């Protein structure tokens, strides 16, 4: 079989990043981007202070990563390629040609690995960079400006708790109705801020409308979103094919050397959907990338959920021990064996099997010597403020032979 | 080791290591060091307003 | 020893327990990104000459860097679908005999007998050679059937406990606490978590539901807090370590941005290749989303004190009666309401 | 503004009626609901009793 | 300094056109009776007295 | 796969064998879902030379 | 799989069928008898 090579620019993931070449990247210490953002101001009267317009300055810095790929040749092939011990030139030429073909076939996939892994690194950094929608949306919708007081922040925190409890598996729960899915996809699209505008050539469709981003999914989610929910705009796109390189020369080179500082289409088969009022890509790269390799696909991440159940609670109040009807759970014995305090809990397994945690399982926790480790508690308690309390009930006296 | 041309010649060569409490930074290398060949810099990638 | 006798025979001592159990789930995600979301730089590829078993290995290294040129947030992710749960929701008690360092009993035969009865009726136990200068790894078993077993940690608390606390998303410490409440100073996290002069932040009519796992040096705090390190020799993950440890927090940022920084994909605190949910192996990078770890809450599942009332006789849905005589049934308040079939 | 009573006891013996016989039964020989009430239970902002 | 002066003064002059609408909204909120009272007054009271 | 993923996959295998056992004579009133699994059957075999 | 699916069985013929001219019974245990609901793949077949 002949391996199918994947180019990074033909993928729809290239619309989420702007690429540029930099030969002197190993000699940077801290690259710096700069922002100057100004804000408008409104005028009022009455018992309000007059306001002045504010200017904000924000500075971000680069983060350096790398890529690695290996390439091996065996000892026999290395001996054949070094032209050492040549003999029988009709029978060793075939072995040398076989070694050359093996080396070329190895080097092809080794060179392809970097273009295959650029998309993986982009997916990893975008997955790290993304806050959850269930926390981003009510925060971006509820507070108008910020610097909230205690009450508004507390109400926002309660609403955040309720929203992250409710909308957690929003695709697999309300999968029967497409309208909720297409309603919250528009929320997810129009809940994030855009980026800067300065560019030369951008990813457009066949007609010429500029696309706004990428929406990467699993293949199951792609077919579920495409079967009835989102509408196809186009099946072709126009992508850039050149990076755009830059170097340092002239006065910038001598500034970097002395001072130590420096200053600065093709037709592709890819689907495009329309969400809200924005035209986005919908890539589900699982066959082009991550197929027949030894790595796991991202977007299959895990979550951790902790469960709590009480075990031996007896309702102390006599009012709370009530039954909904007279003969609910009757027995044969003269004493109903449910008024006794409970000693176990019953819950369901992963597979739906009934399981029981009786009180015998607490022997691993309460029958230890850590139950009698009161010394550090006493040492910490003795360094507090103590008043001279009467000692009638904590004092033992001695006889007097009376 | 900036590599710029010298501004002026210096006379009276002596054992400079004897007077180390003068100046503010003193570095002595036997023949050559790996720290002499290092062209690390900082680059500004643009300003947005 | 008397507690061992009473718990083995069938007696009910004058205590009650709250059990905590952490579970993992495989989720399909969904991420959207804007146009100029990343500024991507590509370096120059360099080749390392490296010897091998018989020949040479060539390692190709290329450095690269990324800049997030967004004034706000330019990428939004959200979990969409639920796959199979990777863990098992079993009944595996945590054994505290893996931990060494506390004061021992005077007589060695009492401690050895206590470990011998504790080993009976449990899965995970220290090995019978008892390796000195070793990890105290539990004895390996045969194949696992339905996933990785998740340990349950037991917290003592009084019997006369308001059961309506556990019917909603509660806190296993007994007193609600955490990073989320600030706005006046920096030394307020300790005053929320440990100062019992003032009332609880959430349930504003009392100090704490239990006084045995909430104070500065109480039983549960002396046993499960990560600062004192009593269970440090245990190779098993404690599912309520995150609820008891004072997290290091910088208050230079506001509450909401610090919450969004906490809300990203944190590193995992368990093991996915072992069979007993051990502690985190060093040098393994697995990023898992952590709901109810930044809120310091825990969701109650469908549990009941009797199997008779847990399922009704109508060939369909389960029962929903709350209390019958002295039993109880807590309805499901977890996010897994319409999943995990019964 | 919300208004609730606490200790209101229905004085008429006619007005103290149950919809069914065995509605809220107990194990005690005296039903602890014929006593005059001493409190009122409402719902919080978040739904907590 | 001159560029900062102009950039400040432009938003300062924009502020009055931005705040005239705010003052109009405030006085219209103050001037408006509720619909829940104004709707049956105009119907169930034809003339007055 | 490791032991844990293999065990979870085996449990899912048992549930899937119990689920779609007599599939055409069971859900004969849902023509959409039969096509939805026929597509899954067809797009599950690797091709040939 | 080395498994065996339980069929619809009961320890008493009284609770095996209900008195509503239709579906069969669903009560699990009554006093000491039992009724095991069908977990086999033959749920919507084999008419009763």
UniProtKB/Swiss-Prot annotation, chain C:
Part of the whole protein covered: 1053 to 1394 of 1396
Subcellular location: Virion; Host nucleus
Function (record text): Self-assembles to form an icosahedral capsid with a T=16 symmetry, about 200 nm in diameter, and consisting of 150 hexons and 12 pentons (total of 162 capsomers). Hexons form the edges and faces of the capsid and are each composed of six MCP molecules. In contrast, one penton is found at each of the 12 vertices. Eleven of the pentons are MCP pentamers, while the last vertex is occupied by the portal complex.
Gene name in the database record: MCP
Self-association and partners: Homomultimer. Makes the hexons and eleven out of twelve pentons. Interacts with triplex proteins 1/TRX1 and 2/TRX2; adjacent capsomers are linked together in groups of three by triplexes, heterotrimeric complexes composed of one molecule of TRX1 and two molecules of TRX2. Interacts with scaffold protein; this interaction allows efficient MCP transport to the host nucleus. Interacts with capsid vertex component 2/CVC2. Interacts with the small capsomere-interacting protein/SCP.
Name under which the protein is recorded: Major capsid protein
Top-level taxon: Viruses
Family note: Belongs to the herpesviridae major capsid protein family.
UniProtKB/Swiss-Prot annotation, chain E:
Localisation: Virion; Host nucleus
Domain of life the protein comes from: Viruses
Family, per entry: Belongs to the herpesviridae major capsid protein family.
Quaternary structure note: Homomultimer. Makes the hexons and eleven out of twelve pentons. Interacts with triplex proteins 1/TRX1 and 2/TRX2; adjacent capsomers are linked together in groups of three by triplexes, heterotrimeric complexes composed of one molecule of TRX1 and two molecules of TRX2. Interacts with scaffold protein; this interaction allows efficient MCP transport to the host nucleus. Interacts with capsid vertex component 2/CVC2. Interacts with the small capsomere-interacting protein/SCP.
Function: Self-assembles to form an icosahedral capsid with a T=16 symmetry, about 200 nm in diameter, and consisting of 150 hexons and 12 pentons (total of 162 capsomers). Hexons form the edges and faces of the capsid and are each composed of six MCP molecules. In contrast, one penton is found at each of the 12 vertices. Eleven of the pentons are MCP pentamers, while the last vertex is occupied by the portal complex.
Protein name stated in the entry: Major capsid protein
Underlying gene: MCP
From-to range in the entire protein, with total length: 173 to 221 of 1396
């Amino acid at each position: 079989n002949t391996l199918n090579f994947v180019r990074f620019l033909e993928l729809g993931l290239s619309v989420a990043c702007i690429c540029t070449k930099f030969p002197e990247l190993a000699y940077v210490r801290d690259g710096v981007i700069q922002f100057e953002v100004q804000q408008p101001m409104i005028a009022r009267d009455g018992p309000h202070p007059v306001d002045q317009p504010v200017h904000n300055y924000m500075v971000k810095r680069i983060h350096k990563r790398s890529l690695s790929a290996a390439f091996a040749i065996a000892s026999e092939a290395l001996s054949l390629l070094s032209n050492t011990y040549v003999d029988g030139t009709e029978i060793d030429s075939s072995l040398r040609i076989r070694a050359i073909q093996q080396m070329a076939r190895n080097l092809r996939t080794v060179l392809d690995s970097f273009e295959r892994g650029t998309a993986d690194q982009l997916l990893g950094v975008l997955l790290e960079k993304a806050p959850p929608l269930s926390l981003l949306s009510p925060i971006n919708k509820f507070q108008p400006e910020g610097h909230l007081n205690r009450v508004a922040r507390a109400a926002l925190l309660s609403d955040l708790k309720r929203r992250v409890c409710a909308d957690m598996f929003f695709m697999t729960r309300h999968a029967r109705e497409p309208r909720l899915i297409s309603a919250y996809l528009s929320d997810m699209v129009s809940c994030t801020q855009p980026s800067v505008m300065v560019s030369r050539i951008t990813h457009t469709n066949t007609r010429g409308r500029q696309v706004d981003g990428v929406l990467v999914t699993t293949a199951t989610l792609k077919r579920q979103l495409l079967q009835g929910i989102l509408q196809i705009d186009d099946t072709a796109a126009d992508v850039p094919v050149t990076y755009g390189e830059m170097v340092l020369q002239g006065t910038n080179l001598v500034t970097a050397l002395v001072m130590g500082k420096a200053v600065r289409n093709a037709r592709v088969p890819a689907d495009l959907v329309i969400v809200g009022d924005k035209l986005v890509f919908l890539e589900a790269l699982e066959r082009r990338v991550y197929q027949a390799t030894r790595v796991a696909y991202p977007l299959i991440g895990n979550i951790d959920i902790t469960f709590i159940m009480p075990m031996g609670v007896f309702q102390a109040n006599s009012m709370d021990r009530y039954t909904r009807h007279a003969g609910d759970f009757s027995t044969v014995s003269e004493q109903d064996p449910r008024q006794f305090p409970p000693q176990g809990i019953f819950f369901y397994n992963k597979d739906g099997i009934l399981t029981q945690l009786t009180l015998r399982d607490a022997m691993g926790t309460i029958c230890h010597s850590s139950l009698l480790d009161v010394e550090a508690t006493l040492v910490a308690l003795r360094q507090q403020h103590l008043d001279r309390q009467c000692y009638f009930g904590v004092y033992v006296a001695e006889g007097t032979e009376d | 080791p900036a590599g710029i041309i010298p501004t002026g010649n210096v006379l009276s060569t002596i054992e400079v290591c004897a007077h180390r409490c003068i100046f503010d930074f003193f570095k002595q290398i036997r023949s050559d060091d790996n720290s002499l060949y290092s062209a690390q810099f900082d680059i500004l990638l643009g300003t947005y307003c | 020893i008397s507690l061992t006798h009473q718990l083995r025979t069938g007696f009910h001592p004058g205590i009650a327990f709250t059990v905590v159990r952490q579970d993992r789930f495989a989720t399909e995600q969904l991420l959207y990104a804007e146009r100029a979301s990343e500024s991507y730089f590509v370096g120059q590829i360099q080749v390392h000459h490296h010897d091998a078993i018989g020949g040479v290995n060539f390692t190709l290294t290329q450095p690269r860097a990324h800049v997030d040129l967004g004034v706000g947030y330019t990428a939004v992710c959200a979990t969409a679908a639920l796959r199979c749960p990777l863990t098992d929701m079993g009944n595996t008690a945590q054994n505290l005999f893996f931990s060494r360092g506390g004061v021992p009993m005077l007589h060695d035969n009492v401690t050895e007998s206590l470990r011998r009865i504790t080993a009976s009726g449990g899965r995970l136990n220290p090995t019978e050679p008892l390796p000195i200068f070793g990890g105290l790894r539990p004895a390996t078993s045969a194949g696992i059937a339905r996933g990785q077993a998740s340990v349950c940690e037991f917290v003592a608390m009084p019997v006369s406990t308001d059961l309506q606390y556990f019917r909603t998303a509660c806190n296993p410490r007994g007193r609600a606490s955490g990073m989320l409440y600030m706005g006046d100073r920096d030394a307020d996290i300790e005053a929320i978590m440990f100062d019992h002069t003032q009332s609880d932040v959430a349930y504003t009519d009392r100090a704490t539901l239990n006084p045995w796992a909430s104070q500065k040096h109480s039983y549960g705090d002396r046993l499960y807090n990560g600062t004192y390190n009593l269970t440090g020799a245990s190779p098993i993950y404690s599912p309520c370590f995150k609820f008891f440890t004072p997290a290091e927090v910088n208050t230079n940022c506001n509450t909401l941005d610090r919450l969004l920084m906490e809300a990203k994909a944190v590193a995992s605190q368990s093991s996915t290749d072992t069979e007993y949910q051990f502690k985190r192996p060093p040098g393994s990078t697995e990023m898992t989303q952590d709901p109810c770890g930044l809120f310091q809450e825990a969701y109650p599942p469908l549990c009941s004190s009797d199997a008779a009332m847990l399922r009704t006789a109508h060939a369909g849905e389960t029962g929903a009666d709350e209390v019958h005589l002295a039993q109880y049934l807590i309805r499901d308040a977890s996010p897994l309401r319409g999943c995990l079939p019964l």
